Curated annotation (Swiss-Prot):
It is an enzyme of class 3 (hydrolase). Transmembrane segments: none annotated. Coiled coil: none annotated. Its EC number is 3.2.1.17. Lysozymes have primarily a bacteriolytic function; those in tissues and body fluids are associated with the monocyte-macrophage system and enhance the activity of immunoagents. Has bacteriolytic activity against M.luteus. Residues 1-129 form the C-type lysozyme domain. Belongs to the glycosyl hydrolase 22 family. This is Lysozyme C.
Length: 129
């Protein structure tokens, strides 16, 4: 599924992301825009052989099992393919664990590079929330 802006923001808000660990809704929507372009089916292979999955590009070295990343942990305890679902529940559950891990949203390279310190409210302007 390719989410619309507002649509995604509403689903994220409904799953408890607004202000989760102090990151307002703008942040998560901005991170999704730049990580996946709002596409739940996005995958990207890294040179280390691991792969990023889904709307939040969650990585197979630590967070999910894809059965082709040697020496990987499955910290969110799901197959990676569950991350590519229409239903963002599993991505959101896993993200909440990634974001509590001590680094915050700096775990996502596109957030750090493209969202961090920008006006993130704009990603939630004009949306019925
Ligand atoms: Cl944090
Ligand atoms: Na893994």
């Amino acid at each position: 599924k390719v989410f619309g802006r507002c649509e995604l923001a509403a689903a994220m808000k409904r799953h408890g992301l607004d202000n989760y660990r102090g990151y307002s809704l703008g942040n998560w929507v901005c991170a999704a825009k730049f990580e996946s372009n709002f596409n739940t089916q996005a995958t990207n292979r890294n040179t280390d052989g691991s792969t990023d999955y889904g709307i939040l590009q969650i990585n197979s070295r630590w967070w999910c099992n894809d059965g082709r990343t040697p020496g990987s942990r499955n910290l969110c305890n799901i197959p990676c393919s569950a991350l590519l679902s229409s239903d963002i529940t599993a991505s959101v559950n896993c993200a909440k664990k990634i974001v509590s891990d001590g680094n915050g949203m700096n775990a996502w390279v596109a957030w750090r590079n493209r969202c961090k310190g920008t006006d993130v409210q704009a990603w939630i302007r004009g949306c019925r929330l």
